[PDB]
Design a protein around this ligand. Structure first.
Ligand SMILES: [Mg+2]
Ligand SMILES: [Mg+2]
Ligand SMILES: [Mg+2]
Ligand SMILES: [Mg+2]
Lengths: 428, 430, 428, 430
């Protein structure tokens, strides 16, 4: 048959940080074709396989993973119908035979998973989002756009890692994207006028030497306004606190990043602080506000702020349905960051999204620090009507490629497309 | 017939700086498809059309250009055979009817030009580089990789704009890429150890606050050596002086005080050549772009007389991908290389004519990125299609740059044993 | 796949002189078809394989070469994609395993090389020139048309071998061809009026019993004018001195062909003479003005005349990139005669052309003395925008077939076609 | 439908003498393709159309004929099934509406006729000879190969125009070709050893300054023997006397002084027959073309009465590929063979009718080249298609001639064990 996979081929390529990753190409007998590139990527998440050959790319080569694709996975999957995504994904999971995908490499597996899906869409002559999600695909995601960085991502005295804008008030994704771009550019103008640095970090945002968190937040609010948008109507704020990076015993220790005199907060006090911020600023989402293991803290945070703020588990959940299931049961968080490569197959990715939806949690499809020209996550967000996406700032094609794909998908959907904005926060 | 173009469609999208650009999609009756994305783009080069609507994207929208594609060019080109690239390019040129492509927009035109070629390669089921260049495509380009920035792209006291590494000594493109990546990463470590900034500029390189040019150069040499490579054997240096940015027209001088502070040198054309020669004798420099001002024709000739035998001398602003300027340079013995910017001329046909004119004069043609890039990697295919031998498409971070390097890896892989990375032998001009 | 070569078949056929050559037919699985005929053809050039069976065709049969195609090359190449020209060419080079292609025969190899390319063009349904050169093919070559012959090609007291006209001033190839035809016919009228012979030699030109070189040259100038063209504007002259045929010690000895009292010139004096001719007559190109081994002579000639006369290496370079590379380095010549069968593959042919272009040398694609009905060289000249061609006089279909193909290619290119005339001499 | 002609296109090209001719290209809806090139071409034969523009090609341009194809015939034939050769030929004949094809041009007509047939063979995916002649095609023709020329084609004192060798004794066409080639080459050596000219005429043969007919004939016999062949067993001779060129209408004599000098014979018709008989008795001559004048009907009959049993007697100018002339010749017992010139009649249909009329009378039909030829080899396919058994297509040099021999090699090769080269048995007229 014409839909039968005839070839599966991987090669080593580079990511947005100049570190190796891999891509896989799948062909069907009919000549349908898919390419799947893998982004960069706990003891309970999928492991990427790196070579450890320090004569090449500082040990970060992916040739072993590539060899696993070409010499092990290829022979197992050639012969399947390209459309049998779940069976293929499951076959790979069983072939690796380890929970963490560490034998074959989560990178090897995911590359194939994606390439197969793209080859199947190509075979059926339909867009990837339709192939993945069926006919009722229509929701363009509300983007959370990383504009300013702190913590491990800065030398400024700021504990939180990501500061985002969310153009919830736009009528369309196309407009939402323009809002973000204009705010980003306004911000850059502001930074220069203050003699602050406008070179960018890994996700296309700035890490300027602000005096502190409030400075950073207020500067963002200033850019929103200068661009002609209304904070708390057109545009909200989001944080990735990545609170695990300053958690140590039983305390969130801000001195790690905010200098000798910074606060050292108990879990009760951390919740207090996040609440202060939320009350002071138009913050609609907080990722990793509590530590990856502070389960009681997560529940309390969620008790106090979960009704009117999105609380996203990133390191708390590591795209792991066992972790998400427990969070759902315990009343911890109300949203999950979905990293395809943290789990390693499209099937498991979609299972996570669906588990989250069924619990009333939002599923926020996410980029990684090391990205590629692939835009599959855009198609995933629309395929599942997830309603939100986290794929970077407004510079760097590693980020902009995803926004561009969303523009295409919106364009292609025509009058059927829906950008729900605030209404995508069904968790609130 | 199945090769006939049935639709031509443009939309506004964003570039790597978050500024609008456009893309075009071409379809044939058979269902072959091509997408052409256009990068960001004086008085004798192609002009991109911007909306000037200060209510959107700070006046940088491309909806007028998109409308020109959809409402004027589409009409004109639908019905051509997708393979008639030259006829289509020429048709667009005549339809605009102005030298600079300013009625339709060079952006509108180039987007169609690229999308058509990509749709044709898709129709024929061959790689773009084969479509564009025929069967004898084999040369992987030696990349000049922008690692450190100065001048208008830094707040460090450094006049020159781009400092590049050229991994000429690698056996393959795949190796050459690794050499660059490893040097880039070693440099980043060095910068951190010195408390210098490692965030990146438009092209994915660093703009650290070095004490001066020699500091910057010596830091690159240190990174090369820390990565285990030998400067002047494995890796050479390249500059983009962008000397037009510090040339005083009126006093006919290269005034370094513009970027290097109050006490910096103010050089006559003779002294500028002297200085470039000093650098070339002190450091393993194999290429200098815009070493003299865009209008300093006598200076270009003198520079070329003094250094042209041993150093590549690339006209960027000197030539602006303009064959009338290139023809004059060839005739006067000015420069020995040209930076080829597809969107500075506006069609693939004219791009390839420029490359061929350069080759025939013994000049190298260095296919180049723009500051505002996209996920498109067509320039990779152009470099290989013409066996040009060199490419200039950024540092070793940012997918706007890396996408091109990744495509070069694919092309190399696809060519197998036929691929040739010529390294230093690509400098046929020297 | 449909593009896969399924058959490669050679047979012995005849050339324009009635001597054996060969042709090869290539078929793809889809039924695409190409036929490659080989023209007739130093210790450092490709060797054609002849049978040496003096019971057939005076030892000039090509059945061994044909057997090499059918029984060795066929089995090696069947299975390749027809479009993999370089790999196929390289495969053949390795299969022969000798520098000079003397095991299989350069004739066997080239026949396959050409037939494959023609089958690939046929497969893709595009013209050969497009297949070979990609999309940017447009330059119709300025032809150098051999009108009068001397030296080894005549019994007249004339040392130089070929005298050519170059209709540089025509607006189009179609016009250029007419200029040449009309001049040729005018010349024939002139020859008859003088009781001179108008039967033709191997390339379709005349070898009349002129009194000397000046007589021959002036007779040509007379024909140019009688046809209504202006020498030195519409039409220039070209020589093939083939100076190797009268070089012996350290002198160009004209007595070999021009009788007992002819000049015996040192290399300095030969340069002097060529300069005299160049100053006296509208000569734009001189092939083999110095001997194949007179390297210092070639450099001096090139120093003295290279700025405003094309200096073509034929025996100097024998389509050998090692020889061309050295000439480029030494400042010897500024043009190369490209004989496909002197090197033996299309790939190496195109590499030579590209090496020449990059040095600022013109590449003049050439016929051989023994030609066939094949017109591939026409397509090669346009494919590479080489700008010039050398393919004979204005009689004999072995020559006219190439001119006819150029008319077709010009016709097919429509308004894109460019005949650059003098501007094709980018070396000057 | 897929077999429908969708385009018919002509262009001006050149013949083997460097004079304009034309070609036509035919396409069907399926993409099947044929190209028909036309060779160079009294009052009862088809007339080629020439422009008469003395500013181009000495008045020999074919642009009017090309325009007739493109602007008149194309219109009329587009829409026919490509396989309807007769209907198309007849349609062209009616569209011209003159006996001689002088309105459209026989050249315009024949180019379309050939191109259509070639496009049809391409459509059906069969060889042209099979398309034209059906399944029972097998006879490779015995070639009459013009080696030496006299009369109007020489300045030697020789009245007869063509002297030919016929390799009748070879087992195959491939061998027959070799025999000719080797004899041709041995002759060239002989000519050089005697200081005679070896440059060639229009048909690739020699026109040396021999002392007379017997010298020329004996030199050919010497070449045959030097090549190791036996005259009158392996190889016979043929003449084209072209006797019309030396026939004095008014004194009703064959006047040899026209070419053989002041003292040459002046023969009555009875004496001409006597002379031809002398030659035939002295030399291994198997065929004589135009032995009598084009209008010497009684002379043709008498010649045929005297020599027709043992010698082939070919009407060229006597018949001008005209079935009214052939019919009269058959009826009066004049000649026993006809030279078939496709362009002297102008369509493939009429060509094949002539061949068939000849066969049915016991006359051989010898398919012939013209002085101005092209790279086309259709006449080879015609010879085999009709099992005609003989061909006249030149000497053993010049691709205008050799292309036909090469095609015959291909056809022979393609037929395999079915091919038959009948040699002397092709002379069914004797
Ligand atoms: Mg996080
Ligand atoms: Mg520059
Ligand atoms: Mg020569
Ligand atoms: Mg005759």
């Amino acid at each position: 048959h014409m839909s039968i996979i005839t070839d599966v081929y991987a090669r080593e390529v580079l990511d947005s940080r100049g570190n190796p990753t891999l891509e896989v190409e799948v062909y069907t007998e009919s000549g349908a074709f898919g390419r799947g590139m893998v982004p960069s990527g706990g003891e309970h998440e999928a492991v990427e396989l790196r070579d450890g050959d320090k004569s090449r790319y500082g040990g970060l080569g992916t040739q072993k993973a590539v060899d696993n694709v070409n010499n092990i996975i290829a022979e197992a999957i050639i012969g399947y119908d390209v459309r049998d995504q779940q069976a293929i994904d499951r076959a790979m999971i069983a072939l690796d035979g380890t929970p963490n995908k560490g034998k074959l490499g989560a990178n090897a597996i995911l590359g194939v998973s994606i390439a197969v899906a793209r080859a199947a869409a190509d075979y059926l002559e339909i867009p990837l989002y339709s192939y993945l999600g069926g006919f009722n695909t229509k929701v363009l995601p509300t983007p959370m756009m990383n504009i300013i960085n702190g913590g491990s991502h800065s030398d400024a005295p700021i504990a939180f890692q990501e500061f985002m804008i969310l153009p919830v008030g736009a009528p369309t994704f196309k407009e939402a994207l323009r809002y973000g771009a204009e705010i980003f550019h306004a911000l850059k103008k502001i930074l220069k006028s203050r003699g602050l640095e406008t070179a960018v970090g890994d996700e296309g945002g700035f890490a300027p030497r602000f005096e502190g968190t409030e400075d950073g937040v207020e500067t963002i609010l200033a850019a929103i306004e200068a661009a002609g948008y209304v904070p708390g109507k057109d545009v909200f704020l989001g944080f990735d606190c990545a609170s695990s990076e300053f958690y140590d015993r039983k305390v969130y220790d801000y001195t790690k990043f905010e200098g000798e005199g910074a606060a050292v907060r108990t879990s009760a006090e951390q919740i207090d602080y996040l609440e202060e911020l939320v009350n002071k600023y138009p913050i609609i989402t907080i990722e990793d506000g509590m530590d990856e293991n502070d389960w009681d803290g997560w529940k309390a945070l969620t008790e106090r702020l979960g009704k009117k703020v999105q609380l996203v588990g990133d390191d708390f959940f590591v795209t792991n349905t066992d972790y998400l299931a427990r969070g759902i049961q315990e009343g911890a968080a109300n949203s999950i960051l979905i990293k395809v490569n943290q789990i390693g197959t499209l099937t498991e990715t979609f299972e996570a999204i669906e588990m989250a939806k069924e619990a009333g949690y939002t599923a926020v499809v996410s980029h990684r620090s090391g990205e590629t020209e692939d835009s599959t996550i855009a198609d995933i967000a629309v395929a599942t009507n997830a309603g939100q996406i986290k794929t970077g700032s407004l510079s760097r094609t590693d980020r902009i490629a995803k926004y561009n794909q969303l523009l295409r998908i919106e364009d292609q959907l025509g009058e059927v497309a829906e950008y729900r904005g605030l209404k995508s926060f069904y968790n609130l």
